[PDB]
Design an enzyme around this catalytic site. Sequence first.
Site, PDB file in Angstrom:
ATOM      1  N   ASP A   1       0.739  -0.881   0.156  1.00  0.00           N
ATOM      2  CA  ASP A   1      -0.060  -0.014  -0.036  1.00  0.00           C
ATOM      3  C   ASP A   1       0.546   1.110  -0.260  1.00  0.00           C
ATOM      4  O   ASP A   1       1.726   1.409   1.146  1.00  0.00           O
ATOM      5  CB  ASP A   1      -1.059  -0.385   1.283  1.00  0.00           C
ATOM      6  CG  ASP A   1      -2.758   0.929   1.006  1.00  0.00           C
ATOM      7  OD1 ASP A   1      -2.714   1.440  -0.255  1.00  0.00           O
ATOM      8  OD2 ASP A   1      -2.791   1.183   2.015  1.00  0.00           O
TER       9      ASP A   1
ATOM     10  N   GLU B   1      -2.129   0.207  -9.076  1.00  0.00           N
ATOM     11  CA  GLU B   1      -2.732   0.599  -8.539  1.00  0.00           C
ATOM     12  C   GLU B   1      -1.695   1.660  -8.923  1.00  0.00           C
ATOM     13  O   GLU B   1      -1.023   2.219  -8.214  1.00  0.00           O
ATOM     14  CB  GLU B   1      -3.553   0.075  -7.047  1.00  0.00           C
ATOM     15  CG  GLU B   1      -4.043   1.073  -6.910  1.00  0.00           C
ATOM     16  CD  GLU B   1      -5.410   1.050  -5.218  1.00  0.00           C
ATOM     17  OE1 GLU B   1      -6.182  -0.046  -5.744  1.00  0.00           O
ATOM     18  OE2 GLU B   1      -5.466   1.843  -4.411  1.00  0.00           O
TER      19      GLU B   1
END
Length: 497
Positions: free
Chosen positions: A170, A276
């Site tokens: 992340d 992402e």
Amino acid sequence: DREMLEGYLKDRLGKVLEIYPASVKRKEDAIFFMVKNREDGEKYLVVIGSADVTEEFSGDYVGEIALEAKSKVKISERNHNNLLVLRQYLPWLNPSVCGKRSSFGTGDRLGIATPAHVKAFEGKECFPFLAQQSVREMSRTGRNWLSVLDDAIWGIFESGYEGAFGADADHVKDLEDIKTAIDAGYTMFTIDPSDHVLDPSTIDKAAAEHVFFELNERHDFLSKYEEKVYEIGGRKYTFDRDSLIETVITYGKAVDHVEKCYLFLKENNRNPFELEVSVDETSTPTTPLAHIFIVEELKRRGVVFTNLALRFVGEWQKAIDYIGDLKELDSTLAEHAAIAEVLGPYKLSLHSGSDKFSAYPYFAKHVGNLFHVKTAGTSYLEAIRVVARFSPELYRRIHEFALQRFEKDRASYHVTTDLSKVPDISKIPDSQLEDLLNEPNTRQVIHITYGSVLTARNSDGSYLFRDELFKTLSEHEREHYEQVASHIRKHLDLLGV
Ligand SMILES: [Zn+2]
Ligand SMILES: [Zn+2]
């Protein structure tokens, strides 16, 4: 019988070692399960079987038990290498790329919440991202990619889950963290370009002029995009000069950064991955023109991505519900989704989506089956609720400490917490202490100070809360599990899956 395994272990080890019945697995002629010591709560692997299987584990042998030929018993610790061998024998204990199916990320700031997250996904079609932490969170909690993934896989092994899962690196910024994440086998990389996002309402006009001039001399954005039309669905989008200048000033060096990261991933990750891109950092909601520009610039440069994280209209503060006009949310979401399908398709990602229940219905309509939603803090909040329920004096101390650390720990985020509305706890009866993890401002104060409480030292070297907190959460394991699992299942239910 299972109880005679527990008695075998107790008589041959002198420890009440209770078997997770859902953990038992049987591959070839071997048995793997997890046990919990009811004295201190520590958990252990047990391998029962052949001579060469039991040899490939670091463990202390407990003898040979008649099975069903005799099978050796080996109790072992969950260090990284035993876990590697277990993932060899139980090959579903490996992260896998998600694809264009919908996904939900249940990040665990503590490393003991994975089985509850597993229980939340039970009965639902939605790819689970079970190992999900940011570089910042790992920095503030003393963990790394390897430890986060190992914790997630330990939790999966406990639960008995044999389905697919994901490991999200992340909010990674610099290529060295990307390299570490590649070495740990992570399956999605969420790249953050904020160091190069330029908020136009802050800088002086002259600096914006200089930045655009550099970017346009290097890339000549005008002759590629100026006055270009994009007819997406009913709507037509036109890159007028001014809008394009401001899109470039805001996102150009950010796109440079993202291209650099994607190229680094092409050169160094042999195994499968997906990517992402995060545009969440802008204070302004992402315009459809900027959405178009970013995705088109990524396509033109050859960047393969699966998830785009727009900054949607409204308020997306941690721990609390979505604030704003629900119908502008609906309409701009229709915009962004309709554009995503023509330029892609790809998935829209909802950063800081934990507890935004009101927006979920709109998201499960226009976004449909191409959504990602990321939650990490809410699990910590539900854990603290359990703590307040069973160790209310510990929660009291944590509450005071957190009110103190709040100002320094918030200057690194962005909240409007109304400290006046934090109830006075010197009056609140220990029974009602958990209920103030329902009051939004206290939710926020507890949310963002997790690092301070989790690493706070005393003078003599002891830790203020960490040890007590984990002890409490271990003693009341199914309480913790029910709380976290039911909240995450609230999420997945409201999201149409
Ligand atoms: Zn950079
Ligand atoms: Zn973000």
